[PDB]
């Protein structure tokens, strides 16, 4: 707990000062080693000496003073919802509107002043202009225009002046907790301290020592010393508590020396005590650093409100009161309103703007005095009031009258921060190193055998192995983008106040990866170059390693540039995928430099991997003579021969040689010359430097964040034009208990709890944070699974049956709804599945209308749920959550879990009024409540109060003004409740659960021996004696509804489907037109094989695009639809399959149409008289491949919790299948060990059948450079000479059978014989299609089974 400079922090800071001065040694008000030393004086001295630099003309304090302040923004006229068939027109129309308006007055003219050292609380309802005010007075007016008449003076500096120079002296913080999760608090603060040390003006203490001291003083000042070595953490990574996480942000901004601050949503997610601690830390900062801060907060506690000097009250953008906080209540009570005795002043000030909550002073109405009731009237009254006159006197007088450390020091400190990040998340990096090591091991094992012999038979495999090496080194840096994106928001924060250049952060990020990149390169290349058995000369190996280093750095920088240009990784997925495809395909192995068409030769020329692969091949092949493997004239008939009458069967061969000079081979096949060896290094370094500079430039300037108004979406079909059943049984539980084995052997969470809820009564379930409130709801609702429950939970005196979980309604704290659905659609979806089967759908529609009317959401019934930022706000989402359960016609109860938590006071009161209205209708509502205000407590009929450990302390009708509860407690020793104390908080103090932990006695035992307890027992006995199909719809109907909703999600998810289809179109079109009519040359055939190979590499991105949709569906299901018994997991998974398949089939059809024909497989099929059959079968394979990618995505996500891990697993399996599919290395060339992997991978059968269909049953046309030349023996034509050989190796054709001086030979006559070498056959095509479909079926079935295992309980 934090108490804002109690003597403990003073002693801690005195110890720190003694340590600093003693370390240096190795006026009496300030000498730590003496008496009279004052810790406040010490911190104040440091804060002054931080801003006392002779070169700095910054102020010692800033205080804003504005008048006429008015802001406005372009009206956000509600716009229709984006859908796959509508987003193109939407983009076109938006582009036209930008190519070629009304306004909304966000804030009407306001005035105010805030001297240094003061704290201002801005009070207003949501949408009242609080955030806009904080952005205006902090000069963050991006997204809206500021009035032409506004005047803002920061103690003399115009807002323009602080924007130009002193930015960071005025700081606006939307959320406090934006931190690197994996740094400890001390590291997070020491990096900031280092970046702020005035590097020229410290003597006697080393700069690291001073930075450490300043970080420790910041921690002690804000009560964080106990978290020195704790990880800062996150909502998903364990670390310091939320309050400590926000006080870390306060300490950080304190170190950075901002003199003016704003905190828009400071206390979001904090309970009363923790929010008070945060405000107290802010007050301590104001006292010490003399900063002025402004906080916009809801549910402001009276204790917290006591700390603010000034208050600002808004409603509809009008200012109603500005001035001292303690005068606000009296000012409004003079206005004509009255504060209920127990109402905290902040709630009074905020409610005075809410007509259904205010209370007009009846006396002042009898006098006929007008009491303003609408915001304009209140603002006019304030303008008239003497408070405004006095405020303007103060304002008018005040309107009458870049980085601390050099660039390289910023780089150094940010690099150290990055290394700390790595050494705290080191597990990921270790798995990362091991992944590359293992992939190198596997690939090298795959090439080990064939490469070993070294004959000319290994040329294609040398090419393929070097292609793998260059790819797996160049792209082994791409998973640093995760860290890049994670760091970007904190870089933006640290830019909002001048701490370092964003270029310094980018440069630190680049330099921090060098260790990992070098280690990966060394390990991978050492393992690979040895297994693959490239040249063992040391110099060539080191040149190879150098080229790989240049490749990895080049790609790292190129894709950092892309990452910098996108909001998230998902948005970069598409262009990054295009870049990967272009670079990998045009590296010079898939299609040699000779065969690249004129339309895309420039791609080779600008591709760095092309030049680097050139250098690698020149290095590998240059100057080495590979002994010839096999000759054309061959066999016993050719035992005796002259050397020149034979030739080696490879490109660079010359007749009569026993070897082929690898340089000749590469010159013939790729046209790389030894003179170009060092071109690769030069171009690679040129690219590396250029893209490094462009990365710095982009990170320096292209960033920002813009404000936009909350909007409702109202799908286009709407924009074209634009009775609740009573509870019937009494639910009572007796002697309830619950134990779980997790934290301790037989640990009780509930202890003999008992009670009941009757129809038409709203029951409050209260307790401290924890205390088994939600646990009691989960047990009563039979929503809990683990542990053992004991005791009675009876309905109408009878044990709850198997229909009970359906008969009740349970509104969870988290309002989770399918974002793409609409409010009306969501309610109708809930009604259809859960209401009794025999109810006609028109009646379900009418009941949904009744429910919509009751919740008074009719004005936005058609809106899209969306998300927090766009769509329904918190109140609307809560109302939708309640409606969804009301539409299930819960026969028995309605369980609510903290409906009023996370809301403001006025929205909370609105929700409580809705709950009481429902109870009046007849509903039996049991709802957990947290820190309710005394006014809300007047709504609940009964109160079940539970002490820590699930130990009931009270259960009774709290009656009027909580008098019954107060009386029960006071009669039993509790100290009298003050007439102005909140009964909820007071009772929480009586039992000792609230801080100040001590109780006059164990009140659990007082209850157990109370008279109320025996009365409850008698009533429970009478309830015991008053006693006189797991799913509603069948599985087929549930599947129908769920699949329809999932379709409506794909539709209306234009980003996903358009990314999928544009990626398909671009990738496959690029493949098809890179190999445009490749022809049937010997190289053309393997080029087409590699084209079919590249057709498959689209797998990863289109799987990763799909996974988020499944995760979005699955979260909603498992979190609300499953416990509610809305539908069975069977329907969920069948919908996931049935909806994903059709879109994959459509994408496959598009891919076929744009790939099969451009590349020319159609002409090959036509030449064979098989156009229709082969075209149809290729279309079937494309559709099957896309369906298979979908099925693999489903399989991997069926048990992986997060999408990233599922994507990684799918990528690894696809990599194995692709590597061992038998084209990068033929099956007979693999080690006998890997034949299982070759046989099992689906891509063997896919690729073999696809290539067979593409190029089977036609003739080969060997180009000039491919023909084999040799001289026929004396006195016989080549026609006669080659006949003996030609009859045994029964294929091949001489270009001239009657030549006698020399003849050219083609060793493949027809493409079928070539395909036989690749092991692909035409007669197998249909069997392969069947096998591939079997793979899809197994993927889907295994996915279903693994979802059943992993996820179903
Ligand atoms: C848009 C970028 N696309 C991708 C880039 C990737 O780069 C990777 C770089 C790596 N090096 C460290 C940074 C490591 C270890 C794995 C990587 C994977 C990967 C992860 C798991 C299994 C296989 C692979 C994989 O295929 O890796 C091929 C290099 C990976 C995956 C995708 C989709
Ligand atoms: N360009 C714009 N920028 C900001 N708000 C706008 C704009 N156009 C219209 N508005 C509307 O003006 C109102 C201003 O309220 P604002 O959000 O600033 O205060 P608030 O809602 O109390 O702040 P917070 O959202 O942090 O609680 C909002 O309802 C918003 O929808
Ligand atoms: N592993 C666990 N899983 C679920 N609940 C647990 C576990 N360990 C302890 N608990 C119990 O969960 C309770 C916290 O939930 P609860 O108090 O119902 O939430 P809330 O107070 O927000 O309604 C604690 O009382 C604690 O005894």
Q: What is the CATH number of the domain that holds 359?
A: 3.40.50.300
- What is the rounded distance in angstroms from the CA atom of residue 741 to the CA atom of residue 806? 28
Q: Report whether residue 787 contacts ligand 3, using a CB cutoff of 6 Å.
A: no
Flag whether 1198 is marked binding.
no
Looking at the fold, whether 899 and 784 belong to one and the same domain comes out as: yes
Looking at the fold, whether 223 and 355 belong to one and the same domain comes out as: yes
Residue nearest to atom 10 of ligand 2 (CA): 709
Q: Is residue 904 part of a domain?
A: yes
Ligand 1 centre distance from Cα of residue 691 (Å): 21
Helix (H, G, I), strand (E, B) or coil at 1270: strand
Flag whether 772 is marked binding.
yes
- Least Cα distance to 903 among 307, 354, 375 occurs for 354
Ligand 3 centre distance from Cα of residue 772 (Å): 6
Q: How many CB atoms lie within 10 A of CB 450?
A: 23
* Kind plus residue range of the DSSP H or E element containing 519: helix 514-531
Burial class (CB in 10 A: 0-12, 13-18, 19+), 88: exposed
Residue nearest to atom 27 of ligand 2 (CA): 126
Residue nearest to atom 9 of ligand 2 (CA): 709
Residue nearest to atom 28 of ligand 1 (CA): 472
User: According to DSSP H, which parts of 123-264 are helical?
Assistant: 130-137, 159-161, 185-196, 207-221, 242-256
Q: Is residue 1182 part of a domain?
A: yes
Looking at the fold, whether 961 and 849 belong to one and the same domain comes out as: yes
User: According to DSSP H, which parts of 855-904 are helical?
Assistant: 874-886
Which of 442, 1211, 1215, 1217 has the most ligand 1 atoms within 8 A of CB, as the residue to mutate? 1211
Q: Which ligand is nearest to the CA of 431?
A: 1
Q: Report whether residue 124 contacts ligand 2, using a CB cutoff of 6 Å.
A: yes
**Structure tokens that stand for 643 in this block:** 């050397």
Residue nearest to atom 12 of ligand 2 (CA): 106
Q: Report whether residue 104 contacts ligand 2, using a CB cutoff of 6 Å.
A: yes
The answer to whether 1261 and 1081 have CB atoms below 8 angstroms apart is yes
- Number of domains into which the chain is organized: 4
- What is the rounded distance in angstroms from the CA atom of residue 1007 to the CA atom of residue 1023? 20
Which of 740, 770, 812, 932 has the most ligand 3 atoms within 8 A of CB, as the residue to mutate? 770
Flag whether 934 is marked binding.
no
Q: Report whether residue 742 contacts ligand 3, using a CB cutoff of 6 Å.
A: yes
Residue at which a domain ends, from 384, 400, 416: 400
Flag whether 1190 is marked binding.
no
Residue 201 DSSP one-character state: S
Q: Report whether residue 1141 contacts ligand 2, using a CB cutoff of 6 Å.
A: no
- Dihedral, 472, 477, 482, 484 alpha carbons, nearest 10: -160
In angstroms and rounded to an integer, the radius of gyration of the C-alpha atoms of the chain is: 38
> In Å, what is the CA distance from 997 to each residue of 942, 991, 993, 1000?
26, 9, 6, 10
Q: Is residue 4 part of a domain?
A: no
Looking at the fold, whether 794 and 694 belong to one and the same domain comes out as: no
Q: Is residue 652 part of a domain?
A: no
Ligand 1 centre distance from Cα of residue 445 (Å): 20
Long-range own/partner contacts, residues 1037-1042 (CB < 8 A, 24 or more apart): 1037/833, 1038/833, 1038/1127, 1038/1128, 1038/1131, 1039/1130, 1039/1131, 1039/1134, 1039/1135, 1039/1138, 1041/829, 1041/832, 1041/833, 1041/1127, 1041/1131, 1042/1127, 1042/1131, 1042/1132, 1042/1134, 1042/1135
821: left (phi > 0), else alpha (psi -120 to 50), else beta?
beta
Ligand 1 centre distance from Cα of residue 552 (Å): 13
The answer to whether 1253 and 1181 have CB atoms below 8 angstroms apart is yes
Q: How many CB atoms lie within 10 A of CB 275?
A: 25
Ligand 1 centre distance from Cα of residue 379 (Å): 61
Q: Report whether residue 353 contacts ligand 3, using a CB cutoff of 6 Å.
A: no
Q: After which residues is the chain broken (C to N over 2.5 A)?
A: 26, 100, 401, 722, 1028
Ligand 1 centre distance from Cα of residue 1221 (Å): 19
- What is the rounded distance in angstroms from the CA atom of residue 1234 to the CA atom of residue 1239? 9
- Which residues lie closer than 8 Å to 226 by C-beta, 6 or more apart? none
- Least Cα distance to 210 among 221, 192, 229, 197 occurs for 197
Output phi, psi for 750, to 5 deg. -130, 140
- Which residues lie closer than 8 Å to 471 by C-beta, 6 or more apart? 584, 587, 609
Residue at which a domain ends, from 1025, 1045, 1078: 1025
- Dihedral, 1284, 1290, 1292, 1294 alpha carbons, nearest 10: 30
- What is the rounded distance in angstroms from the CA atom of residue 464 to the CA atom of residue 451? 11
> In Å, what is the CA distance from 1050 to each residue of 1056, 1060, 1312?
8, 11, 43
Looking at the fold, whether 882 and 958 belong to one and the same domain comes out as: yes
**Structure tokens that stand for 1003 in this block:** 């009140």
- What is the rounded distance in angstroms from the CA atom of residue 709 to the CA atom of residue 732? 47
Looking at the fold, whether 934 and 965 belong to one and the same domain comes out as: yes
Looking at the fold, whether 689 and 753 belong to one and the same domain comes out as: no
Q: Is residue 469 part of a domain?
A: yes
- Which residues lie closer than 8 Å to 867 by C-beta, 6 or more apart? 819
Q: Report whether residue 143 contacts ligand 2, using a CB cutoff of 6 Å.
A: yes
Resolution in A: 3.1
Residue nearest to atom 25 of ligand 3 (CA): 772
- Which residues lie closer than 8 Å to 896 by C-beta, 6 or more apart? 811, 882, 915, 925, 926, 927, 928
CB hemisphere CA count around 550 (13 angstroms):
24
Looking at the fold, whether 381 and 415 belong to one and the same domain comes out as: no
- What is the rounded distance in angstroms from the CA atom of residue 182 to the CA atom of residue 238? 9
Of ligand 3's atoms, which has the minimum distance to the CA of residue 767? 21
Flag whether 831 is marked binding.
no
> In Å, what is the CA distance from 264 to each residue of 175, 304, 871, 907?
7, 16, 20, 18
User: According to DSSP H, which parts of 951-996 are helical?
Assistant: 963-971, 983-990
Q: Which ligand is nearest to the CA of 127?
A: 2
Looking at the fold, whether 1076 and 1013 belong to one and the same domain comes out as: no
Q: Give counts: helices (H), strands (E), the chain.
A: 53, 26
Helix (H, G, I), strand (E, B) or coil at 210: helix
Q: Is the dihedral angle over the CA atoms 527, 532, 536, 537 positive or is it negative?
A: negative
The answer to whether 1353 and 785 have CB atoms below 8 angstroms apart is yes
Q: Is the dihedral angle over the CA atoms 987, 991, 997, 1001 positive or is it negative?
A: positive
Ligand 3 centre distance from Cα of residue 1020 (Å): 27
- What is the rounded distance in angstroms from the CA atom of residue 858 to the CA atom of residue 879? 11
Flag whether 376 is marked binding.
no
**Structure tokens that stand for 1337 in this block:** 């079926």
Ligand 3 centre distance from Cα of residue 962 (Å): 28
Burial class (CB in 10 A: 0-12, 13-18, 19+), 647: buried
Q: Report whether residue 134 contacts ligand 2, using a CB cutoff of 6 Å.
A: no
Residue at which a domain ends, from 336, 365, 400: 400
Range of the domain at 208: 64-73+101-400
- Which residues lie closer than 8 Å to 433 by C-beta, 6 or more apart? 516, 519, 520, 523
Which of 435, 440, 472 has the most ligand 1 atoms within 8 A of CB, as the residue to mutate? 435
Q: Is residue 1038 part of a domain?
A: no
- What is the rounded distance in angstroms from the CA atom of residue 19 to the CA atom of residue 33? 9
What's the distance, Cα to Cα, between the start and end of the chain in Å? 40
Q: Report whether residue 485 contacts ligand 2, using a CB cutoff of 6 Å.
A: no
- What is the rounded distance in angstroms from the CA atom of residue 196 to the CA atom of residue 322? 35
Ligand 2 centre distance from Cα of residue 708 (Å): 7
Residue 836 Cα to chain centre, angstroms? 39
Q: What is the three-state SS of 64-114?
A: EEEEEEEEEEECCCCCCCCCCCCHHHHHHHHHHHHHCCCEEEEEEEEEEEC
Rounded to a whole number, what is the largest CA-CA distance in the chain? 136
Q: Which ligand is nearest to the CA of 77?
A: 2
Of ligand 1's atoms, which has the minimum distance to the CA of residue 1208? 21
Q: Report whether residue 264 contacts ligand 2, using a CB cutoff of 6 Å.
A: yes
Burial class (CB in 10 A: 0-12, 13-18, 19+), 697: middle
Looking at the fold, whether 477 and 614 belong to one and the same domain comes out as: yes
CB hemisphere CA count around 716 (13 angstroms):
10
Q: How many CB atoms lie within 10 A of CB 922?
A: 14
Q: Which ligand is nearest to the CA of 765?
A: 3
Q: Report whether residue 774 contacts ligand 3, using a CB cutoff of 6 Å.
A: yes
Q: Which ligand is nearest to the CA of 316?
A: 2
Ligand 3 centre distance from Cα of residue 770 (Å): 6
Looking at the fold, whether 777 and 879 belong to one and the same domain comes out as: yes
Q: Is residue 1271 part of a domain?
A: no
- What is the rounded distance in angstroms from the CA atom of residue 1346 to the CA atom of residue 1350? 6
Looking at the fold, whether 610 and 462 belong to one and the same domain comes out as: yes
Length of the chain equals 1353
Q: Is residue 791 part of a domain?
A: yes
Flag whether 117 is marked binding.
no
User: Structure solved using which method?
Assistant: cryo-EM
Flag whether 891 is marked binding.
no
The answer to whether 1188 and 1335 have CB atoms below 8 angstroms apart is yes
Which of 432, 436, 476 has the most ligand 1 atoms within 8 A of CB, as the residue to mutate? 476
């Amino acid at each position: 707990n934090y108490n804002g400079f109690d003597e403990h922090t003073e002693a801690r800071i005195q110890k720190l000062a003694r340590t600093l001065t003693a370390q240096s040694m190795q006026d009496p008000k300030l000498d730590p080693n003496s008496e009279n030393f004052s810790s406040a004086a010490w911190v104040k001295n440091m804060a002054h000496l931080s801003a006392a630099d002779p070169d700095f003309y910054k102020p010692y304090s800033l205080g804003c003073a504005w008048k006429n302040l008015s802001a406005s923004g372009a009206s956000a006229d509600v716009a229709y919802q984006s859908t796959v068939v509508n987003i193109p027109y939407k983009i076109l129309k938006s582009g036209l509107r930008k190519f070629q308006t009304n306004t909304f007055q966000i804030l009407k003219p306001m005035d105010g002043c805030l001297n240094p050292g003061e704290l201002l609380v801005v009070l207003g309802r949501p949408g009242s202009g609080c955030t806009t005010l904080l952005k205006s007075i902090s000069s963050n007016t991006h997204g809206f225009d500021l009035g032409a008449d506004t005047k803002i003076s920061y103690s003399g500096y115009s807002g323009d002046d602080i924007k130009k120079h002193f930015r960071g002296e005025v700081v606006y913080n939307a959320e406090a907790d934006v931190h690197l999760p994996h740094l400890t608090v001390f590291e997070t603060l020491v990096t900031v301290a280092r970046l702020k040390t005035p590097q020229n003006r410290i003597k006697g203490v080393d700069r690291e020592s001073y930075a450490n001291h300043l970080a420790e003083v910041a921690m002690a000042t804000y009560g964080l010393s106990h978290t020195r070595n704790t990880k800062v953490g996150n909502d998903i990574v364990r670390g310091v508590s939320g309050g400590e996480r926000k006080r870390v942000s306060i300490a950080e901004v304190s170190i950075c020396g901002s003199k003016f601050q704003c905190w828009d949503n400071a206390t979001r997610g904090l309970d009363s005590a923790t929010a008070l601690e945060f405000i107290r830390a802010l007050k301590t900062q104001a006292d010490i650093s003399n900063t002025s801060a402004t906080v916009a907060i809801y549910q402001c506690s009276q204790d917290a409100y006591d700390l603010f000097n000034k208050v600002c009250v808004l409603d509809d953008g009008y200012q109603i009161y500005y001035g001292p906080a303690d005068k606000a209540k009296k000012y409004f009570e003079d206005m004509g309103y009255v504060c209920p005795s127990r109402q905290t002043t902040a709630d009074f000030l905020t409610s005075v703007t809410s007509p259904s909550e205010r209370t007009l002073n009846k006396d002042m109405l009898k006098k006929g005095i007008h009491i303003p009731q609408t915001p304009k009237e209140m603002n006019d009254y304030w303008v008239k009031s003497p408070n405004y006159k006095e405020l303007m006197k103060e304002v008018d007088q005040r309107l009458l009258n870049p980085y601390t450390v050099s660039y390289m020091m910023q780089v150094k400190y940010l690099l150290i921060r990055n290394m700390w990040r790595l050494r705290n998340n080191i597990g990921f990096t270790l798995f990362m190193i091991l992944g590359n090591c293992s992939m190198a091991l596997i690939l090298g094992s795959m090439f080990f055998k064939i490469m070993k012999k070294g004959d000319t038979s290994t040329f294609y495999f040398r090419g393929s192995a070097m292609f793998f090496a260059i790819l797996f080194n160049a792209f082994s840096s791409l998973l640093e983008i995760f860290s890049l994106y994670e760091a970007r928001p904190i870089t933006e924060k640290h830019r909002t106040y001048s701490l370092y250049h964003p270029s310094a952060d980018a440069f630190a990020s680049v330099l921090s990866e060098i260790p990992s990149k070098l280690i990966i390169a060394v390990c991978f290349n050492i393992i690979f170059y040895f297994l693959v058995d490239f040249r063992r000369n040391g110099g060539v190996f080191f040149f190879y390693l150098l080229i790989n280093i240049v490749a990895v750095f080049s790609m790292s920088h190129l894709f950092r540039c892309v990452g910098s240009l996108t909001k998230t990784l998902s948005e970069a997925m598409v262009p990054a995928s295009m870049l990967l495809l272009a670079l990998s395909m045009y590296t010079g192995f898939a299609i040699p430099k000779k065969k690249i068409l004129r339309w895309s030769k420039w791609i080779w020329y600008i591709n760095p991997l092309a030049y680097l692969f050139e250098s690698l091949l020149i290095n590998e092949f240059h100057g080495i003579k590979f002994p010839c493997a096999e000759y054309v004239p061959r066999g016993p008939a050719y035992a005796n021969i002259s050397s020149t009458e034979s030739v080696c069967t490879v490109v660079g061969a010359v007749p009569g040689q026993d070897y082929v000079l690898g340089d000749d081979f590469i010159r013939g096949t790729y046209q790389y010359y030894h003179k170009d060896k060092w071109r690769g290094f030069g171009i690679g370094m040129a690219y590396v430097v250029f893209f490094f500079f462009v990365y710095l430039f982009l990170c320096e300037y292209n960033e920002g964040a813009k404000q936009k108004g909350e909007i409702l979406v109202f799908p286009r079909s709407i924009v074209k034009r634009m009775g609740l059943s009573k509870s019937e049984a009494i639910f009572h539980w007796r002697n309830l208990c619950y134990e779980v084995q997790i934290k301790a052997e037989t640990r009780r969470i509930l202890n003999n709890v008992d009670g009941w809820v009757k129809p038409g009564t709203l029951t409050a379930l209260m307790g401290a944070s924890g205390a088994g409130k939600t646990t009691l709801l989960d047990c009563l609702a039979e929503r809990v699974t683990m542990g053992v429950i004991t005791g009675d939970i009876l309905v109408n005196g009878i044990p709850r049956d198997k229909s009970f979980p359906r008969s009740i309604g349970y509104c969870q704290q988290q309002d989770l709804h399918l974002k793409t659905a609409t409010v009306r659609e969501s309610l109708r979806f809930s009604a259809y599945l859960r209401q009794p089967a025999e109810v006609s759908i028109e009646e379900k529609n009418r009941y949904v209308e009744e429910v919509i009317k009751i919740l008074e959401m009719e004005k936005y019934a058609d809106a899209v749920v969306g998300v927090a930022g766009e769509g329904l706000n918190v109140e609307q989402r809560k109302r939708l959550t309640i409606g969804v359960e009301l539409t299930a016609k819960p026969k028995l109860l309605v369980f609510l879990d903290e409906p009023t938590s996370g809301l403001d006071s006025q929205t909370a009161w609105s929700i409580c009024q809705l709950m009481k209205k429902l109870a009046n209708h007849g509903q039996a509502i049991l709802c957990t409540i947290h820190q309710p205000s005394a006014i809300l407590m007047q709504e609940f009929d009964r109160l079940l109060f539970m002490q820590r450990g699930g130990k009931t302390v009270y259960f009774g009708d709290l009656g009027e003004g909580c008098k019954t509860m107060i009386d029960y407690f006071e009669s039993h020793g509790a100290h009298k409740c003050p007439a102005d104390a909140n009964p909820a908080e007071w009772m929480l103090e009586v039992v000792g659960a609230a801080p100040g932990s001590h109780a006059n006695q164990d009140y659990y035992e007082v209850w157990r021996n109370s008279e109320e307890y025996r009365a409850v027992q008698s009533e429970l006995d009478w309830m015991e004696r008053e006693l006189p199909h797991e799913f509603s719809q069948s599985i087929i109907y549930q599947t129908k509804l769920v699949s329809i909703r999932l379709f409506q999600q794909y539709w209306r998810s234009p980003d996903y489907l358009w990314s999928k289809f544009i990626l398909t179109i671009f990738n496959q079109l690029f493949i098809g037109f890179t190999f445009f009519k490749a022809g049937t040359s010997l190289q053309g055939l393997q080029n087409q094989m590699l084209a079919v190979f590249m057709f498959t590499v689209i797998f990863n991105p289109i799987l990763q695009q799909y996974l988020p949709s499944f995760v979005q569906q699955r979260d909603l299901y498992e979190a609300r639809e499953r416990p509610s018994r809305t539908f069975s997991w069977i329907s969920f998974i069948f919908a996931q399959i049935f909806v994903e398949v059709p879109w994959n089939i459509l994408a496959g059809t598009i891919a076929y149409f744009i790939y099969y024909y451009p590349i020319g497989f159609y002409s090959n099929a036509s030449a064979a008289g098989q156009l229709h059959e082969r075209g149809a079968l290729f279309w079937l394979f494309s559709c099957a491949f896309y369906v298979y990618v979908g099925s693999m995505g489903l399989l991997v996500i069926s048990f992986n919790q997060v999408a990233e891990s599922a994507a990684n697993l799918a990528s690894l399996l696809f990599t194995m299948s692709l590597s061992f599919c038998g084209v990068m290395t033929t099956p007979s060339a693999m080690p006998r060990f890997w034949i299982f992997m070759y046989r099992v991978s689906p891509l063997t059968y896919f690729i073999q059948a696809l290539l067979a269909v593409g190029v089977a049953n036609v003739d080969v046309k060997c180009a000039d450079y491919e023909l084999l030349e040799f001289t026929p023996p004396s006195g016989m034509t080549c026609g006669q000479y080659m006949e003996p050989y030609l009859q045994l190796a029964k294929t091949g054709y001489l270009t001239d059978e009657n030549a006698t001086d020399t003849c050219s030979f083609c060793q493949i006559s027809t493409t079928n014989d070539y395909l036989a070498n690749v092991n692909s056959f035409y007669s197998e095509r249909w069997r392969n299609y069947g096998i591939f479909i079997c793979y899809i079926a197994f993927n889907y079935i295994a996915g279903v089974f693994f979802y059943w295992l992993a996820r179903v309980p």
